[PDB]
């Protein structure tokens, strides 16, 4: 980028990083927005490689693709009313390969 | 160990009463006098 | 001395300060990361056995490697919620009597007063008997407090100051800085930190808002700038030690990739082992997430020239007026905003 | 870290303006609003307004650090200097005259010591100008007791 | 990583073009389209100027424009193609063919930009051809008929 | 394996547990979202045996 | 439990001639009993009054 | 083309377009904002940059008049004056917010 | 493009009213709004003065 | 005075000037210079094919620039001899204060 697209970006970054700080004991009451950005967070991390032969799946068939590691409480708070549940079981390989 | 309760005042309650019984004084104060207040645990039961 | 008398008999010297003041707050995470976020190698165990009191000592170990396979960024952390903050927001004076080498006044009797009147009025004190060769710690703490010692420095500046600039997010120093400012040439990060003939880059009006703080080898710099080492015996933690230092420079990665590689979680550079936010104690490995350090900012939090209109009438919301006549009500522009009740 | 300014004085004239008749005044014959604040109150880690007022500076201000400037001296005697009249730093001695000579002489040598203005004079500078990085003595202005 | 290629057809935005091939472009002075519009008409009585229908003509002309895209071959591929400077070796042979994969994996990448960029053509013509919205919306209901 | 930071501040953290909420039912007749933030999170918890 | 208490309290640091909405305790003329101390100890016993 | 050691080829391609649309066949219309790349600022325009006019009869008055001008502006001529340049103002360190 | 006026002096008398009396009042003898005004406040990119 | 021909009406002529005209300042540079040869960036522009420029949340004193309640902005008109112009330009909503 030039000069100024990155000092606009900057000043925009700067203004994001003071709001968005502490969003899980801020907005406690707005359950729609939390999973409004639970989704931006999940859809700004760019994927890995596609090698593999048998992988993480649900019971339906479909592969997962990610883990959300959280303290119990906000787990809680997330399967409490903003998350929406799609399975509580899963398959999982059994082997590492050698 | 150490440390404390309290509910809401007014020493000139020339800073007391007039008509509400729900939130009516909170700063701090009017003249010379002494207006003291509240954070002990119910807050609004049992009107006045 | 005349600032010892004036200052203590109420008077008001034609000077103001600044204050800055560091904090700790705990916080819980939130971490999300890709499927082959992380190719792992296990190796093979093996086993030293070792002699004990009476017996023997088995110590099974396994060597492990890893790699990252992700061409962009497979792993993403959020600070998500506040618990607890840690460190106390008092009112601390920081004691400069902790430092040896400076250039020491001809009369030790008049040295010898100003520091009894200035471990006066304060807290910190260098114990004593002023021990030769020792660190000067403070006497000792008893029981402990409700919140590690949060250290207040003072920083000299112009009375007549343009009080709007830290109702925002401002910067200690005067002159707006730091490495994210670059484009041309490499040799800017000193331009730009210390270069008078050039206007500030922030306000872009003026060269400095205070120019006791600002220029190369003023008060300021002279006294707290990690490079002239003044307090380098003192133990106490310097919370404005890192806006007056020049970081170290490469300017091979672009602004944006370095920008992220300081942005994860720095190691601690307070105690949490020792009482007063001592400097960072060797060997403590602590991993912080730290805003504001690498954007060079200092948040204003709630506070008023005056115990006059900080609360208002409605019983809920502080008061709001800003200046009245003479005092100022500067509102809270910390991230602090929903949390921390009144 | 947080940041607060503790003895700001506004200095504008139309800066201390009061937002109604006396929103913020008295009984006392002298409104003592007026006077310059001294004193700063910042809720505390607990909802706590504390107290940092000037007097808690002393700790910093009045160690023998704020007359150490030798450094700064030799920092700045290593820079480009220009030849500059020496009107207002310099002190003579007597040469015992009738004090009515001496003023004589020292008038024809005032005719021409200045090529230009004295930096010193220029106090009619407002805060903004001064500031400005054109001004030619804001370079000099390090330590404010020097 | 293996790119994926994308064919313009796919794309949704295929449907606001008809496109159609034309080998010789290259002599098209100005080709020209026509059109030829009528109206309808109404009759009325009294002091109206009694109308009669009209007729419209309209013609356009086609706009050129162009595509293009590079390549590129580094000296050392040029030396191994030619057989200049070869020894009838096992150890050039993998050269050779490194090289020729190389090409060969860039000409694939240069044929599907021109597709990718018929695309990016279209979305530059239709923006300069729109009107604003804000405009078009009163302009068009405001008036009944003009003049 | 901690300091004097947690419980030399068991008095300046946990009294937060002596300033805000509270003993249940009836003056403010009025609210269903957090009558059960310590009602739907003092019932169940932890550590299982 | 215990708690303390009061008779009319003082203030020192001299911070606070501020003002808000006003005609004040005061006549037609100047200084009988108000630029003067508060009033004391009362109090509200059982049921409203 | 010849560049470097070895060759470039260019392909090229012509192609043309027609708007067979009686009215008005597209609309576009702005939706949302984003960051301003601009700088919402106080830099007084200088009209030293200009040259033709008649000048002021004494050349100091111009060179004393053009220098208290540059106090308490940014952009301003640099300096030596070039004869024959573009009197571009002098650069500056790094860009803040746009 | 935004146009600003700069050195604007409403000049008829009329249209120099105050919605109330004590509006900003000052300490100075001379409230010092009647003056001619000669500047111009807004607000930059990020909300700065 | 822009160079005009009069052969097609006004409103034809209205919705011709109002695609994106081609930009007439510069992006990389830190001081908006004029056009520079050869960049072809192509934006819309209002205010411009109408004559006419809005103005934005001004005032001749920062004390009315913002009221004491804790949120929005002062918005007397006049008080003694200053002003305060609302803002009407069409970012009423955006732009944070």
Excluded at chain 3, 156 to 182: E, I, K, W
Aim: aromatic share 8%; net charge negative.
């Amino acid at each position: 980028l030039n000069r100024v697209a990155r000092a606009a970006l900057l000043s925009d970054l700067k203004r994001r990083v003071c709001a968005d700080m502490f969003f899980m004991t801020r907005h406690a009451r707005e359950p729609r927005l939390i999973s409004a950005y639970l989704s931006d967070m999940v859809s700004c991390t760019q994927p890995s490689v596609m090698v593999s032969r048998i992988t993480h799946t649900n019971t339906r068939g479909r592969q997962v693709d990610g883990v959300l590691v959280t303290t119990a409480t906000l787990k809680r708070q997330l399967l409490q009313g903003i998350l929406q549940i799609d399975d509580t079981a899963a398959d999982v390989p059994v082997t590492y390969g050698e | 160990f150490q440390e404390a309760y309290p509910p809401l005042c007014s020493s000139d309650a020339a800073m007391l009463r007039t008509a509400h019984a729900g939130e009516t004084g909170a700063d701090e104060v009017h003249l010379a006098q002494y207006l003291i207040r509240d954070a002990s645990p119910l807050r609004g039961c049992l009107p006045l | 001395i005349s600032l010892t008398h004036q200052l203590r008999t109420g008077f008001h010297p034609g000077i103001a300060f600044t204050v800055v003041r560091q904090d700790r707050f705990a916080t819980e995470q939130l971490l999300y990361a890709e499927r082959a976020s992380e190719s792992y190698f296990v190796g093979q165990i093996q086993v030293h056995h070792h002699d004990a009191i009476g017996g023997v000592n088995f110590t099974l170990t396994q060597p492990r490697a890893h790699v990252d396979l992700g061409v962009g960024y497979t792993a993403v952390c959020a600070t998500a919620a506040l618990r607890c903050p840690l460190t106390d927001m008092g009112n601390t004076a920081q004691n400069l009597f902790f430092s040896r080498g400076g250039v020491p006044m001809l009369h030790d009797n008049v040295t010898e007063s100003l520091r009894r009147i200035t471990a006066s009025g304060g807290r910190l004190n260098p114990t004593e008997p002023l021990p030769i060769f020792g660190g000067l710690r403070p006497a000792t703490s008893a029981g402990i407090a409700r919140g590690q010692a949060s250290v207040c420095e003072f920083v000299a500046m112009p009375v007549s100051t343009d009080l709007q600039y830290f109702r925002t997010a401002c910067n200690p120093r005067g002159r707006a800085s730091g490495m994210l400012y670059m484009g041309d040439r490499d040799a800017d990060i000193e331009a730009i930190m210390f270069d008078h003939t050039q206007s500030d880059v922030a306000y872009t009006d003026r060269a400095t808002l205070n120019p006791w703080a600002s220029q190369k080898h003023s008060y300021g710099d002279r006294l707290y700038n990690g490079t002239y080492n003044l307090t380098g015996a003192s133990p106490i933690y310097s919370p404005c030690f890192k806006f007056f230092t020049p970081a170290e420079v490469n300017t091979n990665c672009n602004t944006l990739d370095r920008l992220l590689m300081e942005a994860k979680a720095v190691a601690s550079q307070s105690s949490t082992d020792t009482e007063y936010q001592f400097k960072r104690p060797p060997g403590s490995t602590e991993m912080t997430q730290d805003p504001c350090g690498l954007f060079q900012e200092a948040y204003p939090p709630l506070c008023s020239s005056d115990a006059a209109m900080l609360r208002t009438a409605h019983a809920g919301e502080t008061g709001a007026d800003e200046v009245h006549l003479a005092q100022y009500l500067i509102r809270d522009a910390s991230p602090l905003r929903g949390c921390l009740p009144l | 870290t947080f940041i607060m300014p503790m003895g700001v004085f506004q200095a504008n004239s139309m800066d201390r303006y009061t937002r109604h008749a006396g929103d913020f005044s008295t009984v006392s014959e002298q409104d003592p609003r007026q006077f310059p604040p001294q004193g700063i109150f910042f809720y505390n880690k607990d909802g706590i307004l504390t107290q940092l007022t000037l007097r808690d500076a002393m700790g910093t201000i009045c160690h023998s650090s704020l007359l150490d400037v030798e450094a700064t001296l030799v920092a700045l005697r290593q820079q480009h200097l220009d030849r500059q009249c020496y009107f207002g730093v310099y002190v003579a001695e007597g040469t015992e005259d009738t004090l009515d000579v001496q003023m004589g002489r020292f008038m024809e040598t005032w005719a021409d010591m200045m090529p230009h203005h004295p930096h010193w004079v220029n106090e009619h500078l407002t805060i903004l100008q001064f500031i400005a990085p054109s001004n030619p003595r804001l370079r000099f202005e390090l330590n404010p007791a020097f | 990583n293996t790119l994926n290629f994308v064919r313009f057809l796919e794309l949704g935005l295929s449907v606001a073009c008809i496109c159609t091939k034309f080998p010789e472009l290259a002599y098209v002075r100005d080709g020209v389209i026509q059109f030829e519009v009528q109206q309808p008409m109404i009759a009325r009585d009294g002091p109206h100027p009694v109308d009669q229908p009209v007729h419209n003509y309209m013609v356009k002309r086609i706009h050129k424009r162009s595509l293009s895209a590079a390549f590129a071959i580094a000296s050392e591929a040029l030396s191994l193609l030619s057989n200049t400077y070869v020894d009838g070796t096992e150890i050039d042979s993998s050269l050779r063919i490194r090289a020729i994969q190389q090409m060969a994996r860039n000409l694939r990448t240069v044929l599907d930009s021109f597709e990718r960029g018929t695309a990016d053509q279209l979305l530059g013509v239709l923006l300069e051809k729109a009107p604003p919205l804000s405009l078009l919306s009163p302009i068009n209901k405001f008036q009944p008929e003009g003049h | 394996h901690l300091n004097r930071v947690a419980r030399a501040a068991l008095l300046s953290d946990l009294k937060r547990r002596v300033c805000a909420d509270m003993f249940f039912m009836t003056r403010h007749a009025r609210e269903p979202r957090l009558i059960s933030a310590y009602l739907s999170d003092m019932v169940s918890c932890t550590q299982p045996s | 439990i215990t708690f303390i208490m009061p008779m009319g309290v003082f203030q020192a640091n001299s911070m606070d001639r501020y003002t808000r909405h006003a005609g004040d305790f005061s006549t037609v003329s100047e200084q009988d009993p108000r630029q003067f101390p508060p009033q004391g100890i009362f109090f509200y016993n059982k049921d409203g009054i």
